């Protein structure tokens, strides 16, 4: 059953896209939280 393998491979590509767009927002909230800590 190799056709559903290709369908879930496309789903793996969607998972890769979601992981990259989670890396982006974790970088933004890395930057903001790190610029918090110098001022108190």
């Amino acid at each position: 059953h190799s056709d559903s393998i290709r369908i879930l491979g496309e789903n793996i590509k969607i998972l890769d896209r979601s992981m990259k767009t989670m890396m982006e927002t974790m970088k933004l909230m890395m930057e903001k939280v790190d610029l918090l800590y110098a001022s108190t």
Binding site: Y37, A38, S39, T40
Partner: protein, 1605 residues
């Protein structure tokens, strides 16, 4: 009406706010009666100290000469029970001299009068008692106020001020008695005169009280400043010059300077005493505002604090990652930050630690630690029980204060102070059913939400602390106490072993190593030791920079917002000041914040709170502050006091380095919220204090002046009585002598205060008879009498012991020495047995008997507290008395065929029944102060106090005996204890008999002993003659789920010795079922006492008991730590007596019957249990080869970390069980770990470097297991290996054996087939299980004689080698020939001979060896450490050798003497005579003794240089193959290993046929090796002092080495 004068000893703060209430604006009747009795000339409540100096008593007002003679008799019996006649006189002459000196006798008769008045007014419901004469004053007591008038001057005070006067006289009784005893027991003179002058000076200061007590507080820091200012060779300090002692009191300044010029140590001991003078009140109006301010001071801006705290996060992440790599031996997960260093990612993928990470902590700001474990919600049961009282909620704060003081201060009655408002005990309210579910208890703390009733901390001043403004201790609510216990246990179990700073502070071996680094670096003086005492260390932590290391701690333990609660929780809790008769004003049931009596919310938590966090935080700022200035350093963190080793660098001189270091510490610690002055925080190179012990240049001051004069709260959780007063004195002396107090001084002071306490609470008819006082002293708590400081040997030893033979020995010495008949002893004891066995008291306490004494407080105990909590899951715990199931289970256990109460208590503790009984026992003995059993039901127990007084009068006065104890006390004492246990229990008891060690071993001296008379002995020997300086300066020689796991441990212990009982397995399955586990089988698992350990660094000892007990495979009832401690204390007592330890001494057995073999019999339970489970008491292949295979890889991973700097703590295993294990598999497992590791170039250099020398703790352990080696011969690699390689030393042999996988692939292919996959899966936690199979099923090693050259008559020459590699072989050759010529059955050797030479004399058959040790086991330990066959352990007569000092035959080792063996020649056996052996100072020809055919030989013969050439050709291939690898090893200087290979090359060159040059030019480069230079890069190596079948199959490199040049 109301009961008054509660306390018999001081436990409360001291303010005259009640006195100020009585003197100003009062109308209550007790103030009226107190005002009517004071004179016109009235001293205030601050000036009570001036009254009692002028008090002279009419001399000898109490005829206490009976007590003097009784003290001499009691102390004579005690110190003769240890059989010590020298130290007896220095005790009783000192006790007599304290009772003869008029100032000391005035203080002690004053104390007797004070405590007699206390005992006549304790729990007196009558408001006013009549005036009583004390010395020259007249005392009158109204309510809680005391009026005393001497001639015309009166002094109104509270009853706590009168108790402070009574405990000040008691304190001076302590200090003067201990001073006279210490002057008798210390080499410098008696400082009693200096104490008398100090008392006169301190009492003669007529200054205002605050400045006066500032002098009294600063007597110790100014004295430390004087010691520093005289003894700072490396630094200069301003610590002394700040205090105003030269300007305020010139007489005390002259006295302190005089004490400085006599001895700094004695000045520190005199400075150490806290409140032996008059108690300096508590000074609330100024001192409380000081403390409440010190708590909430703000010293640094928040931005710098948070930046520095994040730098502390950087260093804490770096240290914990270092710890995780060092312990788990694999890397924790590492972040991939844009801007992270690529070295960290490369170190993650490689799997090894980088040395460049140590000096670069900043990059670890990008890399955190992932979750490694889970938080244990349920706590450890032992540490919650004691040493701290609580408050139940925030409604229980009104009980501590008086309603009349609140009425006179604010006009209100303090919201019903007699309201109990829940059980005030810790553990009674803990398992009350409110808070018994500990995970659900800390779930709000897991959520981070704190209950409003939790946030309250009671700050209480403590008696006997030298600070005068009042140091407070912390007293929180129950939930915060459980939170503190759980958090500190979670940090201690997991975090501390990883961190390199605090694995020292937890592990005792690492603590010993770091204290040795303290000692060596302070005696050399190169590295300075700073003692950075912070005045407000507990109060300097802020919310902004607490820099709590808790963030990360929270992520590693899989919790969220648990440890972060414990930094804001300092500001959560409301701090109140407990003041007696001075209450903070109540706003709405809560105290209001005034800054004096209450502070609602401070920025710190107090003393003892968040200790484990804050120690790491302080260590973090010290690491940052010292690594920014590039120094090498080590930290000990006590808490409030910090000690740092800082090593001197070559870049800066010592003074400049220390001044830069203090500048950096002030700069960084100012950014840590701890602003420090020069006078507050100071440098040193002499003085440092860790663990509440002050060291000056490594000299610890004795704490005997401080902890003996240290009173506790006493009379807690009972009715006031003589029994627990004497027992509490016993516990006070115990807690003193464990924490570095001399046991002789503690014992003598305990005897003196014991007799004073008998004088207080007994009628004069008893007190006029000396014999009755002595017999009342020496009964003991175990057999039916009063507890005594005599009767515990735990004062002298560890916690666990059997008291019963010691009690019988004390009674036997009482009857035999003192003229007291045994009928008098039976009159005192009145032995009454219970008619039925109460088996629960046996399973809870193995040493406890069935008898019921009346002197013990007879509360209902089992059901009274249970009925009280039932009236006030509490139902499930206490609807069924657990004593029913306990007695049923223990009756079933009593049907064992051998009866063992230790085993019965173990199977008890496996059950939930013992958990229920421990719940009950903590409800019985809560260890809170007064507020749970002392306070509750006080009217019916004052009658019990009078009844127990009348009962001890009736029992002592009536001469009718109980049961006759003459049959027990006759005969030996271990059988007497067992027969008493059988007679009271109905069945004999096996396994609990631990004999008295002085009954077991009675010491003598070696010059006083005869070798053939004297017995098996475990003795010592010093290295120099010892004195007072030698007691102090250190020497050379070294110093629930758990229920399920323990259930599996005992079940697999049953399975590993192959015993199956259906009843026992059924009961154990019932234990598993009641714990909630359905399946019946689950596949899962020289320190001494510290006081006397410093003397043992000059002493040496070993387990020399092997001729009577160790040769049998069965274990024995001998505790060797107790024997060692007894020997150390005998040496300590002889030193302190005035004599010196120059001649070595001995601890020889006197009671040969007293040694009991523990039976090798399994227990079989005859009766099936009727428990049927509970489920309500809890809320929620042969093993020997597998143990061998785990042991080998465990030794491999232990050796793995030694080259980086045992590791897995292998020294906490008995040597005998390791000898039982087969060591064939261990060597294969040790080889395979280094194949599986595949270390890089750098670590293989350290493997070559450190192990050829005799270095390594794991290396020393593997020498210790191979100390006698039948394991070596039976090992299948080693008989094959012994022809192959050239073993040089045993240090060389074992190092070559472990590094054979790295150095030779040829040996690997022989043993590569012996690999098994399932043995890899067997964990190490099973191995200490499976070693038990070695104990019983495993046979003993054969201890076979690997015979060397026996040398009888003549024979064919086989080579005759003995240490031919380094030592002169002919030296040992002629010794073997001389001892065979003399035909000596017994041979004597002195320790001057090299131990490997006297090693080879022990391989001769039929030769008993009696070394002239003179006391020293070190020489025999060295020549046992040199063998490889184990025959040295069988032929050396240890009891004859070890205790013999003088020459008794033919001695090897003197240079010249009568009866002394001392060190052409055409002889076939030896080519030349290097050493001529002289017998009886006469030369005798050696050549007549020649060699013989031999068996398999020990490692003295060196099999490669024997007749076989093919193994030596293999060796010639092997050494060149080693050198080709080691040249390719990076960072490895091959100078010694090239020399070893060149010695092998000369040995080869004798056979290769080419002539041997004495000095070879030997060009060496990469690898090629030749004399002629192949290329210009080859380096010249200077070596001095130097058929044809071997050419077949020769490598090209050995072909270059063949031809010269």
């Amino acid at each position: 009406a109301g009961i008054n004068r509660t306390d018999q000893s001081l436990k409360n703060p001291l303010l005259g706010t009640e006195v100020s209430f009585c003197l100003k604006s009062s109308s209550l009747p007790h103030h009226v009666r107190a005002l009517g009795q004071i004179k016109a000339r009235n001293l205030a409540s601050c000036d009570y100290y001036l009254l009692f100096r002028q008090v002279v008593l009419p001399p000898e007002v109490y005829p206490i000469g009976v007590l003097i003679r009784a003290a001499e008799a009691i102390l004579t019996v005690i110190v003769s029970a240890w059989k010590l006649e020298h130290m007896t006189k220095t005790l009783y002459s000192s006790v007599r001299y304290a009772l003869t000196n008029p100032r000391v006798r005035a203080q002690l008769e004053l104390h007797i009068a004070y405590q007699r008045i206390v005992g006549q007014v304790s729990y007196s419901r009558e408001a006013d008692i009549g005036p009583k004469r004390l010395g020259n004053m007249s005392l009158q007591f109204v309510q809680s106020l005391v009026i005393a008038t001497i001639d015309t001057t009166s002094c109104l005070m509270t009853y706590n001020h009168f108790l402070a006067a009574a405990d000040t006289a008691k304190s001076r009784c302590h200090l003067l008695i201990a001073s006279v005893v210490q002057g008798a027991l210390w080499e410098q003179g008696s400082f009693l005169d200096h104490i008398i002058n100090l008392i006169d000076t301190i009492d003669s200061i007529n200054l205002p009280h605050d400045d006066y007590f500032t002098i009294i507080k600063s007597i110790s820091p100014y004295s430390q400043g004087l010691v520093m200012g005289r003894h700072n060779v490396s630094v200069s300090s301003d610590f002394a010059s700040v205090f105003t002692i030269p300007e305020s009191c010139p007489q005390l300044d002259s006295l302190l300077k005089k004490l400085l010029q006599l001895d700094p140590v004695l000045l520190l001991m005199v400075s150490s005493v806290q409140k032996s003078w008059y108690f300096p009140e508590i000074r609330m109006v100024d001192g409380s505002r000081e403390q409440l301010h010190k708590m909430r001071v703000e010293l640094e801006t928040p931005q710098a604090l948070l930046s520095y705290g994040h730098t502390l996060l950087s260093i804490f992440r770096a240290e914990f990652i270092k710890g995780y790599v060092s312990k788990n031996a694999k890397w924790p997960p590492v972040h991939l930050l844009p801007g992270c260093d690529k070295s960290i990612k490369n170190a993650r993928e490689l799997g090894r630690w980088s040395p460049a990470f140590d000096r670069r902590w900043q990059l670890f700001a990008k890399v955190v630690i992932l979750r490694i474990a889970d938080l244990d919600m349920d706590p450890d049961f032992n540490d919650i029980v004691s040493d701290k009282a609580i408050i139940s909620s925030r409604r229980d704060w009104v009980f501590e204060y008086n309603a009349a003081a609140f009425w006179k201060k604010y006009g209100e009655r303090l919201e019903r102070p007699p309201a109990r408002s829940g059980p005030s005990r810790l553990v009674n309210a803990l398992i009350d059913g409110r808070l018994d579910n500990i995970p659900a208890l800390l779930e709000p703390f897991y959520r981070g939400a704190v209950e409003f009733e939790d946030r309250l901390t009671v700050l209480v001043p403590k008696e006997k602390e030298l600070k005068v403004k009042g140091r407070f201790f912390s007293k929180q609510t129950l939930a915060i106490r459980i939170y503190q216990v759980v958090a500190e246990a979670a940090l201690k179990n997991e975090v501390m072993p990883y961190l390199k700073t605090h694995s020292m502070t937890m592990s005792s071996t690492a603590l010993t190593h770091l204290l040795n680094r303290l000692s060596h670096t302070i005696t050399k003086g190169d590295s300075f030791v700073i003692n950075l005492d912070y005045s407000s260390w507990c109060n300097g932590f802020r919310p902004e920079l607490q820099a709590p290391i808790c963030r990360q701690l929270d992520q590693m333990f899989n919790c969220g917002y648990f440890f972060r609660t414990g930094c804001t929780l300092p500001c959560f809790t409301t701090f109140i000041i407990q003041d007696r008769f001075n209450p903070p004003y109540s706003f709405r049931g809560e105290p209001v914040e005034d800054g004096v009596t209450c502070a609602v919310g401070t920025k710190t938590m107090g003393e003892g709170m968040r200790q484990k966090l804050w120690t790491i935080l302080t260590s973090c700022w010290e690491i940052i502050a010292l690594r920014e200035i590039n120094v090498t350093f080590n930290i000990l963190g006590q808490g409030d006091n910090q000690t740092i080793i800082i090593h001197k660098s070559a870049s800066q001189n010592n003074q400049l380095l220390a001044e830069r270091a203090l500048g950096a510490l002030y700069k960084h610690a100012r950014l840590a919220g701890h602003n420090l002055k020069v006078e507050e925080c100071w440098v040193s190179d002499c003085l440092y204090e860790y663990g509440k012990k002050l060291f000056f240049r490594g000299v610890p001051v004795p704490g005997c002046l401080k902890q003996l004069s240290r009173v506790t709260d006493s009379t807690g959780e009972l009715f006031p009585n003589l029994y627990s007063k004497l027992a509490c004195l016993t516990s006070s002396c115990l807690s003193a002598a464990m924490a570095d107090t001399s046991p002789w001084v503690a014992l003598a002071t305990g005897v003196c205060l014991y007799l004073i306490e008998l004088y207080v609470e007994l009628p004069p008819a008893i007190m006029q008879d000396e014999s009755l006082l002595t017999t009342l002293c020496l009964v003991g708590p175990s057999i039916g009498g009063l507890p005594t400081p005599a009767t515990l040997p735990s004062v002298f030893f560890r916690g666990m012991s059997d008291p019963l033979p010691f009690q019988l020995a004390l009674l036997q010495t009482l009857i035999k020495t003192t003229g007291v008949t045994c009928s008098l002893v039976n009159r005192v004891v009145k032995l009454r047995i219970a008619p039925y066995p109460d088996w629960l008291s046996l399973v809870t306490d193995p040493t406890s008997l069935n008898i019921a004494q009346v002197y013990r407080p007879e509360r209902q105990i089992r059901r009274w507290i249970e009925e009280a909590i039932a009236t006030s899951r509490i139902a499930t715990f206490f609807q069924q008395p657990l004593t029913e199931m306990a007695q049923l289970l223990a009756r079933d256990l009593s049907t064992m065929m051998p009866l063992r109460p230790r085993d019965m208590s173990a199977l008890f503790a496996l059950s939930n029944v013992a958990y229920g009984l421990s719940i009950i026992d903590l409800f019985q003995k809560s260890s809170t102060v007064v507020s749970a059993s002392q306070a509750v039901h006080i009217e019916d127990v004052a009658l019990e106090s009078v009844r127990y007084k009348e009962s001890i009068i009736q029992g002592l006065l009536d001469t009718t005996e109980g049961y006759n104890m003459q049959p027990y006390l006759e005969g030996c004492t271990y059988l007497a204890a067992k027969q008493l246990r059988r007679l009271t229990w109905g069945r004999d008891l096996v396994g609990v008999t631990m004999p008295f060690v002085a009954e077991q071993f009675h010491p003598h001296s070696s010059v006083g002993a005869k070798a053939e008379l004297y017995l098996d002995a475990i003795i010592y020997c010093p290295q120099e003659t010892l004195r007072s300086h030698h007691l102090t300066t250190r020497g050379d020689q070294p110093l629930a789920a758990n229920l399920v796991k323990d259930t599996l441990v005992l079940h697999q212990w049953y399975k590993v010795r192959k015993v199956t009982d259906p009843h026992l397995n059924t009961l154990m399955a019932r234990f598993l079922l009641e714990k909630g586990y359905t399946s019946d089988a689950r596949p899962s698992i020289q320190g001494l006492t510290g006081y006397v350990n410093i003397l043992s660094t000059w002493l040496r000892f070993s387990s020399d008991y092997l001729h009577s007990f160790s040769k049998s495979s069965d274990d024995y009832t001998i505790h060797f730590q107790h024997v060692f401690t007894y020997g150390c204390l005998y040496a300590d007592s002889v030193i302190r007596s005035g004599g010196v330890i120059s001649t070595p001494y001995l601890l020889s057995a006197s009671c040969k019957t007293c040694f009991e073999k523990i039976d090798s019999e399994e227990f079989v339970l005859a009766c099936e249990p009727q428990y049927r489970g509970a489920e309500w008491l809890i809320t929620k292949f042969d093993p020997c080869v597998s143990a061998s295979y785990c042991l080998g890889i465990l030794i491999g991973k232990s050796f793995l970390v030694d080259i980086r700097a045992t590791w897995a703590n292998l020294e906490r295993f008995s040597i005998s069980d390791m000898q039982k294990l087969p060591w064939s598999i261990v060597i294969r497992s040790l080889w395979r770990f280094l194949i599986g590791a595949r270390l890089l170039q750098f670590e293989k250099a350290g493997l070559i470097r450190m192990l050829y020398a005799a270095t390594g703790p794991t290396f020393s352990f593997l020498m210790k297991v191979f100390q006698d080696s039948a394991l070596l011969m039976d090992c299948a690699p080693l008989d094959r290996l012994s022809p192959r390689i050239n073993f040089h030393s045993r240090g060389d042999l074992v190092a070559k054996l472990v590094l054979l996988p790295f150095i030779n692939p040829g040996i690997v292919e022989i043993e590569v087939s012996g690999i098994n996959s399932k043995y890899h899966a067997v964990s190490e936690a099973n191995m200490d299980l499976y070693i038990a199979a070695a104990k019983s099923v495993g046979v003993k090693p054969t201890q076979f004689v690997e015979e060397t050259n026996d040398f009888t008559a003549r024979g064919h020459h086989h080579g005759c080698y003995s240490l031919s590699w380094s030592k002169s072989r002919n030296q040992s050759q002629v010794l073997k020939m001389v001892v065979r010529k003399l035909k000596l059955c017994v041979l004597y050797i002195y320790p001057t001979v090299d131990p490997a030479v006297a090693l080879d004399l022990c391989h001769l058959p039929a030769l008993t060896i009696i070394l002239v040790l003179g006391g020293d086991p070190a020489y025999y330990e060295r020549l046992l450490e040199m063998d490889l066959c184990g025959a040295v352990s069988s032929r050396v007569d240890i009891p004859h050798s070890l205790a013999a000092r003088t020459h008794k035959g033919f001695t090897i080792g003197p240079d010249t003497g009568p009866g002394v063996i001392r060190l052409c020649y055409a002889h076939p056996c030896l080519e030349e005579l290097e050493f001529n052996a002289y017998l009886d100072s006469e030369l005798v020809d050696i050549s007549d003794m020649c060699c013989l055919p031999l068996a398999t030989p020990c490692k003295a013969l060196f099999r490669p240089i024997y007749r076989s050439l093919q193994s030596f050709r293999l060796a010639l291939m092997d050494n060149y193959s080693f050198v080709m690898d080691l040249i390719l090893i990076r960072g490895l200087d091959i100078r010694p290993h090239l020399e070893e290979f060149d010695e092998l090359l000369v040995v080869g060159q004798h056979i290769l046929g080419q002539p041997v040059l004495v000095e070879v030019v030997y060009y060496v480069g990469v690898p090629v090796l030749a004399r002629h230079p192949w290329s210009a890069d080859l380096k010249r190596i200077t070596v001095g002092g130097r058929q044809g079948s071997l050419l077949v199959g020769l490598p090209a490199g050995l072909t270059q080495l063949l031809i010269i040049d």
